[PDB]
Amino acid sequence: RRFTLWASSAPPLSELQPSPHSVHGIYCSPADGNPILLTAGSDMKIRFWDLAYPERSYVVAGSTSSPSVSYYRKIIEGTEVVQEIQNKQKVGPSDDTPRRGPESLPVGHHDIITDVATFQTTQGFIVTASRDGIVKVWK
Amino acid sequence: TAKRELFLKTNAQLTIRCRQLLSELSYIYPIDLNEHKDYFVCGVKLPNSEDFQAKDDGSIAVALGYTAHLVSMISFFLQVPLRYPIIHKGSRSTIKDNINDKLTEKEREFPLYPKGGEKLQFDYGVYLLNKNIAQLRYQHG
Amino acid sequence: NKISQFKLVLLGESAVGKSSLVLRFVKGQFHEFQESTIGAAFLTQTVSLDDTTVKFEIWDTAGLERYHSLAPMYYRGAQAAIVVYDITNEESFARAKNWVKELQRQASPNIVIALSGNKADLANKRAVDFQEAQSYADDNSLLFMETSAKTSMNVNEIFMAIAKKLPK
Amino acid sequence: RIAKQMMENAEWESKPPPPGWRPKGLLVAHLHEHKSAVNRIRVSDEHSLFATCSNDGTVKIWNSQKMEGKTTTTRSILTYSRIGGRVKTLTFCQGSHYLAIASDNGAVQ
Amino acid sequence: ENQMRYAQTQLDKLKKTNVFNATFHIWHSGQFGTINNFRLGRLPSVPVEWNEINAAWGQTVLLLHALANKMGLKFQRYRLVPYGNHSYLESLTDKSKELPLYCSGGLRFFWDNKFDHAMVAFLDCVQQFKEEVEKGETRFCLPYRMDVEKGKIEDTGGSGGSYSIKTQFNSEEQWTKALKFMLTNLKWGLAWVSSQFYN
Numbered sequence A: 001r002r003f004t005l006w007a008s009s010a011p012p013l014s015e016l017q018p019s020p021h022s023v024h025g026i027y028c029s030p031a032d033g034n035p036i037l038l039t040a041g042s043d044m045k046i047r048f049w050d051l052a053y054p055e056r057s058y059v060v061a062g063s064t065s066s067p068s069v070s071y072y073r074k075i076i077e078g079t080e081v082v083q084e085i086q087n088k089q090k091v092g093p094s095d096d097t098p099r100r101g102p103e104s105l106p107v108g109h110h111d112i113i114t115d116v117a118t119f120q121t122t123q124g125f126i127v128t129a130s131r132d133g134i135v136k137v138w139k
Numbered sequence B: 001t002a003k004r005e006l007f008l009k010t011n012a013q014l015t016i017r018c019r020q021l022l023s024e025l026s027y028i029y030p031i032d033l034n035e036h037k038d039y040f041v042c043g044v045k046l047p048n049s050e051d052f053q054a055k056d057d058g059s060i061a062v063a064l065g066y067t068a069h070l071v072s073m074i075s076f077f078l079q080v081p082l083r084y085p086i087i088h089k090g091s092r093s094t095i096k097d098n099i100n101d102k103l104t105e106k107e108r109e110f111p112l113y114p115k116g117g118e119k120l121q122f123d124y125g126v127y128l129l130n131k132n133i134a135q136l137r138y139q140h141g
Numbered sequence C: 001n002k003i004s005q006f007k008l009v010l011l012g013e014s015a016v017g018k019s020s021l022v023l024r025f026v027k028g029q030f031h032e033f034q035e036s037t038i039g040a041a042f043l044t045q046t047v048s049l050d051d052t053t054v055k056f057e058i059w060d061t062a063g064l065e066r067y068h069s070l071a072p073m074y075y076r077g078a079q080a081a082i083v084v085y086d087i088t089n090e091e092s093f094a095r096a097k098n099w100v101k102e103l104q105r106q107a108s109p110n111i112v113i114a115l116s117g118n119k120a121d122l123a124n125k126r127a128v129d130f131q132e133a134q135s136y137a138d139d140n141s142l143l144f145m146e147t148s149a150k151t152s153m154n155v156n157e158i159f160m161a162i163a164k165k166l167p168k
Numbered sequence D: 001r002i003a004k005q006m007m008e009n010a011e012w013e014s015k016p017p018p019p020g021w022r023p024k025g026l027l028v029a030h031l032h033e034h035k036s037a038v039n040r041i042r043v044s045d046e047h048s049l050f051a052t053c054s055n056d057g058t059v060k061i062w063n064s065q066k067m068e069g070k071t072t073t074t075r076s077i078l079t080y081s082r083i084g085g086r087v088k089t090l091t092f093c094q095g096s097h098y099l100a101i102a103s104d105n106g107a108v109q
Numbered sequence E: 001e002n003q004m005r006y007a008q009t010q011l012d013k014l015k016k017t018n019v020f021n022a023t024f025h026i027w028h029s030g031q032f033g034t035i036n037n038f039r040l041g042r043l044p045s046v047p048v049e050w051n052e053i054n055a056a057w058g059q060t061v062l063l064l065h066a067l068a069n070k071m072g073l074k075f076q077r078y079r080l081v082p083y084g085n086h087s088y089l090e091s092l093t094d095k096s097k098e099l100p101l102y103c104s105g106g107l108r109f110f111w112d113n114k115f116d117h118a119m120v121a122f123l124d125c126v127q128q129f130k131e132e133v134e135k136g137e138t139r140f141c142l143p144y145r146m147d148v149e150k151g152k153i154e155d156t157g158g159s160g161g162s163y164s165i166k167t168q169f170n171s172e173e174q175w176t177k178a179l180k181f182m183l184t185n186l187k188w189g190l191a192w193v194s195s196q197f198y199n
C-alpha cells in the first residue's frame, strides 16, 4: 500500500467507518490528464482526487453543512497517509444525529451510487446510478 | 428478504396514497385561487398558444398562471427536484439559458412577465412545456 | 525519518549457508536442517542507520549450478549482492570468485558487493585463510566479513555494512 | 480477429474525454430503468448509446444524442429486450454495437 | 445487504410528505411582514416600491379569499375582484364605489382615499371574521383590536397601541406598524383557520 487514504479525523486508521464507508463506487483513468472520482458511501457523495494536485483536489459534488476539504498528505513511515481534512464532515461510528438520511444530499435524493461513470458525447459529463433503480446526470 | 420488501412496499404505497389525495386536492381546489386546470393542457406537441393566455385571462390570470412554481414548492414537502427549477416568489418570471459551468445568470434567455421577450419567448416556454409533459406522462403511465 | 528500498541478491555454491544467513538476519532463527532452496526465495528485512530505514528486498537464489542461468534474472537491477562461501571449503571460495566476476561483468556497475565467509564457527576446519579472502575483497572493493548463521556472528553486521555503503 | 464480430455484429471505435478535474458538475437530468435495482450499466462508444436493465431481466436502453436533441429521452425507453430470466451480468462487445448478457439460469446470449 | 437507505427513503419520504397544511408562507423581516417574499408596509425612511406593495396586496387578497372559503366564513359586506397587483374590493356598505386596493395614482393622489375605504372595509371584514370564528370558540381569544372607521390596527397586552390604516401622507409608525400587527393577527388567523379546515 504505497498510499492509504482515510476520511478519519485521526491520521492512523481508527475504525470510524459506518458500513457504507466501505461500500462505494469508484472511477479512475490511466489516461486523459489522470483524474480520479470516488464515492464516499458514508456521506453518499462524489469526491474528486486529481493525480495532478492532491492538495488542490476540489470535489465535484457538494455537501449541505460544510463542503471544503484540506486534503493534506502527512507521513508516518510505511504509508504517505492522506488527511482528508473536510471542514465539518459530521460522520462517525454511531448515530449521534436524529435523522441524517435521504434528505441530506446535493440536489437529487438517492440511495448510494452503485455505479458512477463518465461519457463525452459532446462535452464531458457524468452519470450516477443508485441502488434505487434511479439515475442522475451531471454536466 | 420477504419482510423487508413487504415493509418497503407498504410504507411507500401507504404514504403515496395519504398525500396523493392532497396533491389531487392541490389541483382540484381553486376555492383558494381561481382558474385551475386539473391535469388538462393544450400544449401537447404544440410549442405556442393563446387559448386563454393573453385572451380569457385579462392580466390577472396571466400573472396568476405564473404561480405554478408554488404547486412545485408544495410538492417539495417530500423533498425532490423537477425538470425546470421549482422556486416560487409570487407573480413574475424569466427563464434561464443554460447551466454546467456558467459564472453569471442566464434569466435573459426568455422574459416571462413582459411580452417584449417574444422572440426568445418562442423558445423558453418549451422548457416549462417539457416540465409539464414529463409530469403528465408520469401521471398517465 | 525516510525509507530507502534496495534489491539484494544472495549468490554462492549450494550448501554454503545462504538461506541460513538470511533466516538469521530476517527471523533471528537458524535450523540445522535447513532445506536446500529450489529456484529463489523472496524475503525482506530492515536496518536503521542515520535516521534512514533501509529495507532490503532479498532474493535468496538456489546455488545449484543448474540454476546458474536463472541468476541474471534475479541480479538484474540489484543494488547489492552477498556472495557466500564456506570457510571450510576452498573450492566454494573459487566458485565465489567466479560469481564476483560475473557480477563485475554483467550486473549494475553501482552494485555494492559483500563477501561472506560463512560457517566461521567451524574455524578448526578452516580451509580458506582470512587474509587471502580479505586481500581478494580489498582488491575488488568488496565488503568482507566472516559470518556464522549458526552463532549469529557478523550476520547483522554484514547487512549493516552494506546499508552504510549504499547510496541513501 | 473478427470472425464473429463481422458475421452479424456492427462496429465502432472508443471515445475518451479531455481532463475533467476542471468542471464542476451540475445535475442536468434524472430517470430510471424500473423501480427494481439496475442489474448492470453499460454505455456504448457509438452515440454514447446507454444500456441498462431492471433486476427482473427486462432491458432499458436510450440514445444520448437523442437526449441532446429532443430532450424527451428521460420519460421513455428507447430499446427493450425480453431475456426471460434475471440478468447476472452485462458487458459490451469491444469495438462493437453488439451487447453480451448472462442470466441466473446459466444461459448466455 | 441492501435495505438500509431504503428504510431511509420510506421514513424520510413519508415524514416529509406529511408537511402540506397551509397556502402562503409569511416571514417577519425588519419592521414588516413579508408574504411569500413580498414586502408589505413602506418604512418612514424608505417608500418600498409600489409594484411590490401592490403585488403584496394582490397576494393578500388571494390569501383572504382562500381562508374564508376554508372556514366557511363569507364576507356579506364585500365582493372580491382580484386583478393581480391591481386587485379591488367592492364593499357593499360603500356600493363598490372605490374598490382599488392599489395605491399610487398621481402626485396629489398621495392624499387619495381609494385604499383607505378598501382598508376600512377590510378591517370591518376582519371583525366579521373574528366573530365568525368566535362562534366556534376554537383555539383562540381576542388579542386584536382595530379602529376600522379612522383606519386602525391595534394589539392588546404589553403594547396596547393602535396605528392607523392610512399614511395620511408618509407611511410612518402609522401604516407600517398597523400592517405588522394586522399580519400577526392574520398569522394567528391562518393557524386557527388551518386547524378548523383540517378538523
Ligand SMILES: Nc1nc2c(ncn2[C@@H]2O[C@H](COP(=O)(O)OP(=O)(O)OP(=O)(O)O)[C@@H](O)[C@H]2O)c(=O)[nH]1
Binding pocket: C012, C013, C014, C015, C016, C017, C018, C019, C020, C021, C031, C032, C033, C034, C035, C036, C037, C038, C061, C062, C063, C064, C118, C119, C120, C121, C122, C147, C148, C149, C150, C151
Ligand atoms: N556449522 C554451520 N553450519 C551452517 C552454517 N550456515 C549454514 N549451515 C548449514 O549448512 C547446510 C546448508 O545451508 P543452507 O542455508 O541450506 O545453504 P544454501 O547456500 O542456501 O544452499 P542452496 O539453497 O542449495 O544453494 C545446512 O545444514 C545449514 O544448517 C553456519 O554458519 N555454520
Ligand SMILES: [Mg+2]
Binding pocket: C018, C019, C020, C035, C036, C037, C060, C061, C062, C063
Ligand atoms: Mg538455499
